[PDB]
C-alpha cells in the first residue's frame, strides 16, 4: 500500500505547475518542514453573534493588528525651547495652559506630529497613547499632548534631569518610534477582511449560502489571537501547520496537514484517492511529532541500516 500511495502522489506532482506560495515549492515546504513561512497567513472567523457588522469586524481588526509609532507618526522635529513653562512655537500655548492648571528639565523640546486618519482607523484616540508613553516611563519624560479635537496633533515631551542632549534625544526618539507597542499582538501585520459564505443548514432543514465576514492576516501567532474577544475560538485556522501542531496537539496537527496537502494537490490535477494521502500523513505523523522526509528526518529512526 505504501508504494502504491507514494507513486499515486508522486506522478501527479510531476504535471503540476511551477501573493501566496503554491505549487511545487509549497509542496516541498509542507512535505519537508522546514518551519519557514513565506505566507504565514491564518484565517480568523468572527463570533457568530456578529454576523455582518462591518464596524465590529473593523473593531476586531483594530484589536488584533500590531501597531507602533511608525504606523502613526507623520512628522518628527526637534526644538530648542528655552522656557520650561512657555513656548517659542506660537501655536503650542493652549496646550501649555491645559497642562498647567517638576521643573528641572532640559530646555530641548522634542515634537511629534500624527495623522488623524491613522489614529482613528484603529480607534486610538491620542489621549491614551499620551498616557501610554507616560506610564511607559513615568520617571524620565514629561509627556504633554493636544486634545483629540484639534486640527493638528502634537506630542510635547522633554527629558527631566537631576550638554550633548541632541544625540540622546535622537536615540530616545528612535526608541520611541521603534519599540512602543500601541495595540494588537505582535507578528501580525496589515489584516484584511473578505466577505465569505458558508452552506449553513437552513432553519427549515435545507442548505443556503449564507454570507459572513472573515478576518484574514499576513502574519502568524496563535497563543493570543485565540484569546481576543469577539472571536470564534473554535474554528480558527492557520496554514502553518507546525504552529497548529504545537498549540493543538498532533491530532489536530495531522488533520491540518492533511487539509494542507489536499489543498496543494487539489489546486490542480485533482484527484487522488483519500486513503493514499491519509497514509502519507499518518506515516509522517506516527512518532508523536512531525517528521520531515529528509536525509535525516525519517532516516534517523531505529530502522534497518541497509535501507
Amino acid at each position: 500500500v505504501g508504494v502504491l500511495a507514494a507513486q499515486s502522489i508522486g506522478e501527479p506532482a510531476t504535471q503540476m505547475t511551477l501573493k501566496v506560495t503554491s505549487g511545487v515549492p509549497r509542496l516541498k515546504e509542507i512535505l519537508n518542514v522546514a518551519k519557514n513561512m513565506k505566507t504565514p497567513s491564518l484565517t480568523v472567523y468572527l463570533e457568530p453573534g456578529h454576523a455582518a457588522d462591518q464596524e465590529q469586524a473593523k473593531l476586531i481588526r483594530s484589536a488584533i493588528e500590531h501597531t507602533t509609532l511608525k504606523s502613526v507618526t507623520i512628522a518628527s522635529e526637534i526644538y530648542y525651547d528655552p522656557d520650561p513653562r512657555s513656548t517659542v512655537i506660537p501655536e503650542d500655548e493652549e496646550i501649555i495652559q491645559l497642562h498647567f492648571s517638576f521643573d528641572q528639565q532640559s530646555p530641548w523640546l522634542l515634537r511629534l506630529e500624527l495623522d488623524r486618519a491613522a489614529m482613528n482607523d484603529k480607534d486610538l484616540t491620542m489621549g491614551q497613547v499620551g498616557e501610554r508613553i507616560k506610564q511607559t516611563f513615568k520617571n524620565d519624560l514629561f509627556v504633554i499632548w493636544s486634545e483629540d479635537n484639534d486640527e493638528k496633533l502634537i506630542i510635547r515631551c522633554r527629558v527631566v534631569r537631576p550638554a550633548e542632549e541632541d544625540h540622546m534625544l535622537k536615540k530616545i526618539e528612535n526608541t520611541m518610534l521603534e519599540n512602543i507597542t500601541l495595540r494588537g499582538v505582535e507578528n501580525i501585520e496589515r489584516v484584511v477582511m473578505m466577505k465569505y459564505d458558508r452552506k449553513v443548514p437552513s432553519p427549515t432543514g435545507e442548505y443556503v449560502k449564507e454570507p459572513e465576514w472573515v478576518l484574514e492576516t499576513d502574519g502568524v501567532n496563535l497563543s493570543e489571537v485565540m484569546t481576543v474577544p469577539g472571536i470564534d475560538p473554535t474554528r480558527i485556522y492557520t496554514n502553518s501547520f507546525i504552529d497548529i501542531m504545537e498549540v493543538l496537539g498532533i491530532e489536530a496537527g495531522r488533520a491540518a496537514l492533511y487539509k494542507e496537502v489536499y489543498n496543494v494537490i487539489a489546486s490542480d490535477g485533482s484527484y487522488v484517492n483519500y486513503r493514499h494521502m491519509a497514509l502519507l500523513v499518518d506515516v509522517m505523523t506516527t512518532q508523536g511529532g512531525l517528521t520531515s522526509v529528509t536525509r535525516h528526518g525519517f532516516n534517523r529512526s531505529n530502522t534497518g541500516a541497509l535501507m
Binding site: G10, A13, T14, M16, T17, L18, V24, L27, K28, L31
Partner: protein, 168 residues
Amino acid sequence: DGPTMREITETIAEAKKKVLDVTKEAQANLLTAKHGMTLRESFEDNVVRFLNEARDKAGRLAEVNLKDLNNVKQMVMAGSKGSFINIAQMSACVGQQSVEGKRIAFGFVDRTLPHFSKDDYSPESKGFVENSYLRGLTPQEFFFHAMGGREGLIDTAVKTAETGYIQR
C-alpha cells in the same frame, strides 16, 4: 466567414475603446483606486480583464458560427483532440501574451520595445496579439509570443528535475 470576421474585428475594436477610456480616466487622475490594491494594480487588472473578455467573446462567436461540416469542430466535439481555445486562437484572436501574470514589462526604459514612443499602455504596445494565426503576426507580436513560449519551456525544464527528486 466574412461577416463573422467583421464582427470579430469590431468586437476587438470596442474592447480597445474601453481600454482607451480607462487610460484617459487614469491619466486624468480620477479613479476608484480599487481596495486592497495599488492604483497601477487596479489599472492593470481592469485592462487585462477587458482583453481576456474580448478574446473569449470573439472565440465564442467564431465557434457558434462554425459549420457542422467543419472537421476540427467534428474532432473537438468528438472528444479526442483540440479545444475551444485552439479554435479561437487559430481563427479569431491570439490574445494577450503573458510573463508571470503581468504583461510584458518595460525592459527598455519606459517602453517595451524600441519601435514605440515612451510611456504607452495601449495593448498593442505592451503586447496584446490582436491578430490570429490565419493572418499571421506583426513582428512585435511575434516577439511577445516568443516570450510566452520561452517562459513555458524553462518552467518545464526546472519542474521536471525537482519533481523527480521529490518523487524519489
